[PDB]
Design an enzyme around this catalytic site. Structure first.
Site, PDB file in Angstrom:
ATOM      1  N   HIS A  36       0.885  -1.155   0.000  1.00 14.31           N
ATOM      2  CA  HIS A  36       0.000   0.000   0.000  1.00 14.31           C
ATOM      3  C   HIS A  36       0.935   1.219   0.000  1.00 14.31           C
ATOM      4  O   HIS A  36       2.125   1.079   0.324  1.00 14.31           O
ATOM      5  CB  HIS A  36      -0.907  -0.012   1.259  1.00 14.31           C
ATOM      6  CG  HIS A  36      -0.150  -0.199   2.536  1.00 14.31           C
ATOM      7  ND1 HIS A  36      -0.119  -1.420   3.181  1.00 14.31           N
ATOM      8  CD2 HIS A  36       0.653   0.659   3.202  1.00 14.31           C
ATOM      9  CE1 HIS A  36       0.687  -1.260   4.216  1.00 14.31           C
ATOM     10  NE2 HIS A  36       1.168  -0.031   4.272  1.00 14.31           N
ATOM     11  N   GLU A  37       0.402   2.405  -0.357  1.00 12.71           N
ATOM     12  CA  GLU A  37       1.165   3.658  -0.364  1.00 12.71           C
ATOM     13  C   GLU A  37       1.440   4.024   1.082  1.00 12.71           C
ATOM     14  O   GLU A  37       0.541   3.864   1.920  1.00 12.71           O
ATOM     15  CB  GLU A  37       0.400   4.769  -1.112  1.00 12.71           C
ATOM     16  CG  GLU A  37       0.167   4.448  -2.583  1.00 12.71           C
ATOM     17  CD  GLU A  37      -0.424   5.547  -3.446  1.00 12.71           C
ATOM     18  OE1 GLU A  37      -1.069   6.448  -2.878  1.00 12.71           O
ATOM     19  OE2 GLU A  37      -0.244   5.517  -4.685  1.00 12.71           O
TER      20      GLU A  37
HETATM   21 ZN   LIG Z   1       2.721   0.338   5.327  1.00 13.32          ZN
HETATM   22 ZN   LIG Z   2      -2.014   7.357  -4.394  1.00 12.62          ZN
END
Ligand SMILES: [Zn+2]
Ligand SMILES: [Zn+2]
Ligand SMILES: *[C@@H]1O[C@H](CO)[C@@H](O)[C@H](O)[C@H]1NC(C)=O
Ligand SMILES: *[C@@H]1O[C@H](CO)[C@@H](O)[C@H](O)[C@H]1NC(C)=O
Ligand SMILES: *[C@@H]1O[C@H](CO)[C@@H](O)[C@H](O)[C@H]1NC(C)=O
Ligand SMILES: *[C@@H]1O[C@H](CO)[C@@H](O)[C@H](O)[C@H]1NC(C)=O
Ligand SMILES: *[C@@H]1O[C@H](CO)[C@@H](O)[C@H](O)[C@H]1NC(C)=O
Ligand SMILES: *[C@@H]1O[C@H](CO)[C@@H](O)[C@H](O)[C@H]1NC(C)=O
Ligand SMILES: [Zn+2]
Ligand SMILES: [Zn+2]
Ligand SMILES: [Zn+2]
Ligand SMILES: [Zn+2]
Ligand SMILES: [Zn+2]
Ligand SMILES: [Zn+2]
Ligand SMILES: [Zn+2]
Ligand SMILES: [Zn+2]
Ligand SMILES: [Zn+2]
Ligand SMILES: [Zn+2]
Ligand SMILES: [Zn+2]
Ligand SMILES: [Zn+2]
Lengths: 301, 301
Positions: free
Chosen positions: A170-171
């Site tokens: 994830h970002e």
């Molecule tokens: Zn993370």
């Molecule tokens: Zn993003």
């Protein structure tokens, strides 16, 4: 660069110099665009990223096209967006608004890009054959260290091609409208509040989303409002979503109208509006859904 | 068994023979019970599994107790259960019904148990210090093969203690009330239907849940009903959840009443009922939530 040990017989030498074996699949990613590539006997075949192990929906359980577009946004995974029932769904075509075709997702509606091993970052091939048993997900089996791996072809017993399954990513950053970068878990007080102050958290939700919460009290009733944002990057467009809860103190009374957090104005279900915030034009909508749910997206050209 | 290379100075020799270094944490799991263990200078300290990186909720953003109990069930991860707003929450104590304390979750409200490496299955320590930078999640950095790892202590530059972060796991089997075992993605027709036949899928949802769907048509309106189940095992109790959608053909009209799928009876919001199905007593409830939402749990002693 050297070439794999057969079986499988036949190799693909890709544009980047990477050598894949016949039967292998990998992801070719260009900016935010994604292709699903196959090493066939005669060479490389690329197409729209299809994700299987689906069910239901108006498409007879056809595979997902990941990413897909829906409601002006891009989804890289299955979503519950738009649904009151919490079921994870995906579009069976790249454009949902156009084609309107979908399936529901299962724990297997994902593509696992491997790391390490023999396979140069190839996708997991399910089912893969190991100890004469077909594995439809990553395994710890046949390993002392208990590491999770998969065969990158249909037959691991024969081809010996594998890779390790990493933790999903994830970002890591929430970027504020003010350009301030925060990490998942960081807290700050909202920069532009309607007198009523807000506490922010960099939550993520795989898109670097940050949520701002404001608590109101009359000792009889507690009004809780929250707004979630993400700024634009290569993968995601700006999005804004606000909720309002009216709980006795808890016991919830449905909130069937919206209050825009940066204007303080009250909109009813089915109402659209525009706003200019921090030097950007936004288009907004009031859904309600008993939680005063409203969304905003930047005005598109 | 040999002992780690210092730093850190000091070791714990656990009941199983596993040697951990000072500052390391690991999970001690007994059946379905979980403990979070620490290697302190004087020895091993165990306590309730606490998960941090939370925000909001009535508890000032206190950590999660994972697993936790809520509404007669056990949750091993954050849930949206009970919420109309889709926010992932967790209980800050082991018993929610008793203590009523909670926080909201972020992408970091998880504990990552490592595999391979130096650390014998120790948890990731966040932040861990690497190349004079603090990592709050697993990294690809410092590796040619691009494998995701983490330091199992506060300082990796100094202690050199690490492990690999595997892909998260879920139960692979859906077991039917009839004892039939299916894998995630398998489809079958429902064994006990109300004349109106159902199509089943082993979906998972990290608990081996299977969903059964029945489509009704009058050419003007389309009634879609679905029921989700899981059978009992060491981690999970039996649960049943049914929905009903009434869409024009789509455009949804809220369904504010429940129809039990194994009896065909209509219940209103706030109504409780009992049923004897396949040799088990069930307690049921009608929530509605515009989707004819009803749940059942086996009658407890
Ligand atoms: Zn993370
Ligand atoms: Zn993003
Ligand atoms: C394994 O899977 C392949 C197709 O996925 C199937 O053709 C084969 O019969 C299966 N055999 C075993 C040993 O499970
Ligand atoms: C982000 O959005 C702004 C428009 O408000 C645009 O000017 C900028 O080019 C965009 N940049 C990225 C990184 O997408
Ligand atoms: C919450 O409930 C009270 C009455 O129960 C109502 O007056 C109030 O309008 C509701 N919410 C707000 C935004 O005031
Ligand atoms: C790294 O984190 C520790 C606490 O987590 C902090 O004390 C230290 O100042 C941080 N230093 C760096 C180099 O980021
Ligand atoms: C599962 O539930 C049945 C009760 O219906 C019980 O008899 C059985 O012991 C339970 N077994 C497990 C594996 O939990
Ligand atoms: C769906 O809508 C029609 C009228 O719009 C209504 O008569 C029907 O009761 C609704 N659902 C069911 C279960 O019939
Ligand atoms: Zn070759
Ligand atoms: Zn539900
Ligand atoms: Zn699986
Ligand atoms: Zn500003
Ligand atoms: Zn909310
Ligand atoms: Zn939206
Ligand atoms: Zn020692
Ligand atoms: Zn939402
Ligand atoms: Zn039966
Ligand atoms: Zn289970
Ligand atoms: Zn449903
Ligand atoms: Zn329930």
């Amino acid at each position: 660069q050297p070439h794999p040990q057969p079986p499988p017989y036949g190799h693909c030498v890709t544009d980047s110099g990477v050598v894949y074996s016949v039967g292998m699949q990998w992801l070719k990613t260009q900016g935010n665009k994604q292709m699903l590539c196959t090493c066939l006997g005669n060479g490389v075949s690329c197409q729209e990223t299809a994700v299987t192990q689906t069910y239901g929906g108006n498409s007879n359980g056809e595979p997902c096209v990941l990413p897909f577009t829906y409601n002006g946004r891009t989804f890289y995974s299955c979503t519950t967006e738009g649904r009151q029932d919490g079921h994870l769904w995906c579009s069976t075509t790249s454009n949902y608004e156009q084609d309107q075709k979908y399936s529901f997702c299962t724990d297997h509606t994902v593509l696992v890009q491997t790391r390490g091993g023999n396979s140069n970052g190839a996708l997991c091939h399910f089912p893969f054959l190991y100890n004469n048993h077909n594995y439809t997900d990553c395994t710890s089996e046949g390993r002392r260290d208990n590491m999770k791996w998969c065969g990158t072809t249909q037959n691991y017993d024969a081809d010996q091609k594998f890779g390790f399954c990493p933790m999903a990513a994830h970002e890591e950053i929430c970027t504020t409208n003010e350009g301030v970068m925060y990490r998942i878990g960081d807290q700050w007080d909202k920069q532009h509040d309607m007198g009523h102050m807000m506490r922010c958290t960099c939550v993520g939700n795989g898109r670097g989303e940050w949520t701002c919460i404001a608590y109101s009290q009359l000792r009889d009733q507690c009004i809780v409002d929250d707004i979630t944002y993400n700024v634009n990057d290569t993968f995601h467009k700006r999005h804004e979503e606000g909720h309002m809860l009216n709980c006795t103190c808890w016991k919830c009374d449905p909130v069937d109208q919206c209050q825009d957090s940066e204007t303080g104005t009250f909109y009813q279900i089915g109402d659209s509006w525009e706003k200019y915030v921090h030097g950007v034009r936004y288009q907004c909508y009031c859904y309600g859904r008993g939680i005063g749910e409203w969304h905003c997206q930047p005005l598109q050209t």
